[PDB]
Predict the 3D structure of the following.
Amino acid sequence: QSIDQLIKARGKVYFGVATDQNRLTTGKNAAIIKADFGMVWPENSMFWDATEPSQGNFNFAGADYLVNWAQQNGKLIGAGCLVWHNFLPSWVSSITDKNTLINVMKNHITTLMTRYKGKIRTWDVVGEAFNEDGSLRQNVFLNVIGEDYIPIAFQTARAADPNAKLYIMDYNLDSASYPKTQAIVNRVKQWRAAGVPIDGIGSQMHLSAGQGAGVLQALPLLASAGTPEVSILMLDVAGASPTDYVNVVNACLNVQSCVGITVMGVADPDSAFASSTPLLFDGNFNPKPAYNAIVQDLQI
Ligand SMILES: O=[N+]([O-])c1ccc2nn[nH]c2c1
C-alpha cells in the first residue's frame, strides 16, 4: 500500500522522498516513488555547488531532470536550500562586500525560482541558520550582511515565485526542551510579525534510535510559531525501528499545520548513512518493517 495515498486519506498533503536522475534511472526507485510517494525533492541537484558552481554560471541539467520527471509523473516538488552554509562554493564564502553578497544571494534565489516558477510547491529558502544555543549561525551571510539576510532572502523568494510556500529549515529541532527549538520559534514569530513571508518551518529529522517519541512534543512547539505550515524533512532513523517511524508520522498527524513528511531517500544502500540502515526500503527494494508499520498506523 502507498503511504502517500494513506496519509492523504488522513488529510495531509504528501509523503515525499529525496531523489535525483541517477536514482530514477536505476534500482526500483522510480517504481516505488510512482506508487508510494506523492512529492519529490532534489537530493543534491538544487544545492548551490550543483546549480551555481561559479558566479552566474548556472548548471540546471540535474534539477531539470528531476522537475521534468516529477511533472510527468504527477508528483509535487519541493526544493532547496537556497541560502545555507552547506554545499556552498568558495566563490560565495570569499565575498566580503555586503551589497555584492546581497545581490549574489538574490540572483541565486531569483534565477533558481524563476526557472521553475509555478512548478515548485515548497522552497526551503533559508537553512541551518541557528546555532545549537539558539543564536544565529555565523555563516558568510550573517558575517557579511548581518541578520537582515534572512528577511531579504524571504522577500526575494516571494517576489520570484509568489505561488511557492517558503520555508526556513533546521535540524536538532526534535526536542521541545532544547534551546534551538524554542529559539527558531521565537525568531519566526517575530519575522512574520514584521511582514517577512515565512510560510513554513521544516524540521530536518536525521534521527538516532529512540528519538521519534520526542517529536510528538517538539513538532507542536514548532507549529506554535504560527506559520501556515510545518513539515518534516530529511527524515531517516538509525536502525529504522517501526516505533520511531510511527511516532514521527503520528506527530505529523497530531499537528494540524503539518502538511507532510519527506524521507531522506528510498532504499538503505543509497543513504549517506547506509550502515545504520535508516530508510524504509532495504537493499533489495523491499518494504521494511517500518514501512509496513507506517501502513498499519495510517490504515476516535
Ligand atoms: O526532505 N528532504 O529530504 C530534503 C532534501 C534536500 C533538500 N533541500 N532543501 N530541502 C530539502 C529537503
